[PDB]
């Protein structure tokens, strides 16, 4: 029951950290990408075509710890709409962007996202061209979140917000081996061939089984 592919991604983990610091922009944008930490990156590159929904959670504190009551706003941008620019621009009052208004003293918010690609499935490798135009797939755009505090008064809060992620109904198609070399770029497999790590530590000789 536990070696299956649905359970292999099922438990939730951290994916991101943002900072507001309203005194002074007043908001924080953040892209949707599961390639944030290397721990979840090394698992999900064992395959090539996946198909899966998602659901998030926003857990916020203050800088000191005292959680006075306020009212935030977690927006969402489907891929194709322009991102916000200032804290008071006209991209905060549209009807295509689903908003979630939650206080601070309440238990944390929760929202799910359906599968949002024109292809039949995502890809984690794309050989070709749609130098810098190499390997940039136009079919992984998922959106943003654009956290913004709600006031008229420009309150002096300094917040930090974490994003947790869970996957559901995962179906993976074809396998591939696990990457051994460490990472250098966020979106390219480059590996610094001046020095290569090995896959096994050395030992004395070939005739001594005791390591």
Partner 1 sequence: IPAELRPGTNQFLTTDDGTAAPILPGFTPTPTIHIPGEVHSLLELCRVETILEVNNTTEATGLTRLLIPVSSQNKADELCAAFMVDPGRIGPWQSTLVGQICRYYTQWSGSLKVTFMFTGSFMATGKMLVAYSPPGSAQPANRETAMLGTHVIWDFGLQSSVSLVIPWISNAGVVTLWYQTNYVVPPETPGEAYIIAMGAAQDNFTLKICKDTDEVTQQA
Partner 2 sequence: NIVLAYGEWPEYCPDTDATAKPTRPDVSVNRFYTLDSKMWQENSTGWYWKFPDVLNKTGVFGQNAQFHYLYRSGFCLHVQCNASKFHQGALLVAVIPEFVIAGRGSPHPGFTTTFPGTTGATFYDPYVLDSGVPLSQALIYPHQWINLRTNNCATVIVPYINAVPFDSAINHSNFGLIVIPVSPLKYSSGATTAIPITITIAPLNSEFGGLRQ
Residues in the chain: 211
Cβ neighbours for 28, distance < 8 A, ≥ 6 positions apart = 18, 19, 20, 146, 147, 161
Phi-psi domain of 80 (left: phi exceeds 0; alpha: psi -120 through 50; beta: other): left
Closest separation between CB of residue 132 and partner 1, Å?
22
Exactly one of 3, 4, 24, 105 binds a second copy (CB under 8 A); that residue is: 105
In whole angstroms, how close is the CB of 1 to a second copy at the nearest point? 13
Q: How many CA atoms lie within 13 A of 82 on its CB side?
A: 9
Question: Could you say whether residue 115 binds a second copy (CB under 8 A)?
Answer: no
Sign of the C-alpha dihedral, residues 83, 87, 150, 95? negative
Give least dist CB 62 to a second copy, A. Answer: 7
Instruction: Please check whether residue 91 is in contact with residue 210, taking contact to mean a CB–CB distance below 8 angstroms.
Output: no
Distance linking the first and last C-alpha atoms of the chain: 35
Residue 136 touches which of partner 2, partner 1, a second copy, none (Cβ within 5-8 Å per kind): none
Question: Per rule CB under 8 A, is residue 49 in the interface with a second copy?
Answer: no
Give the shortest CB-151-to-a second copy separation in angstroms.
5
The Cα-based distances of 169 to 35, 55, 57, 166 in angstroms read 19, 12, 18, 11
| Interface of this chain with partner 2, residues 60 to 79, rule: CB under 8 A | none
Region 14-33 residues binding a second copy, contact defined as CB under 8 A: 14
User: If residue 44 lies in a helix (H) or strand (E), which one and from where to where?
Assistant: helix 38-44
Q: Considering beta carbons, is residue 61 or 156 the nearer one to partner 1?
A: 61
**Which two tokens mark 41?**
């990156």
Q: Which option in a second copy, partner 2, partner 1, none does residue 208 bind, with CB closer than 5 to 8 A by kind?
A: partner 1
Question: What is the smallest separation between the CB atom of 154 and a second copy, expressed in angstroms?
Answer: 9
Query: Given the complex with a second copy, which of 11 and 207 has the nearer CB atom?
Result: 11
Name the residues that contact partner 2, by CB under 8 A.
Answer: 48-49, 119-121, 123, 125-132, 134-135, 174-181, 184, 188-194, 196, 199
| Residue ranges in contact with a second copy by CB under 8 A | 11-14, 37, 39-40, 59, 61-71, 93-96, 98, 101, 103, 105-108, 118, 149-153, 155, 157, 160
């Amino acid at each position: 029951l536990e070696t299956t592919i649905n359970h292999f991604f099922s438990r939730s983990g951290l994916v991101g950290v943002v900072n507001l610091t309203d005194g002074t922009t007043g908001y924080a944008t953040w892209d949707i990408d599961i390639m944030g930490f290397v721990q979840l990156r090394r698992k999900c590159e064992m395959f090539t075509y996946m198909r899966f929904n998602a659901e998030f959670t926003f857990v916020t504190t203050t800088e000191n710890g005292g959680a006075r009551p306020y009212m935030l706003q977690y927006m969402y941008v489907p891929p194709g709409a322009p991102k916000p620019t200032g804290r008071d621009a006209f991209q905060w009052q549209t009807a295509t962007n689903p908003s979630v208004f939650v206080k601070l003293t309440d238990p944390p918010a929760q929202v799910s996202v359906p599968f949002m690609s024109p292809a039949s499935a995502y890809q984690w490798f794309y050989d070709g061209y749609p130098n810098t135009t190499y390997g940039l797939c136009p079919n992984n755009m998922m959106g943003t979140f654009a956290v913004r505090v709600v006031s008229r008064e420009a309150s002096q809060l300094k917040l930090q917000t974490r994003v947790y992620m869970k996957l559901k109904h995962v179906r993976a198609w074809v396998p591939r081996p696990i990457r051994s070399q460490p990472y250098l770029l966020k979106n390219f497999p480059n590996y610094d061939s001046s020095k290569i790590t090995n896959s096994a530590r050395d030992r004395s000789s070939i005739k001594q089984a005791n390591m």
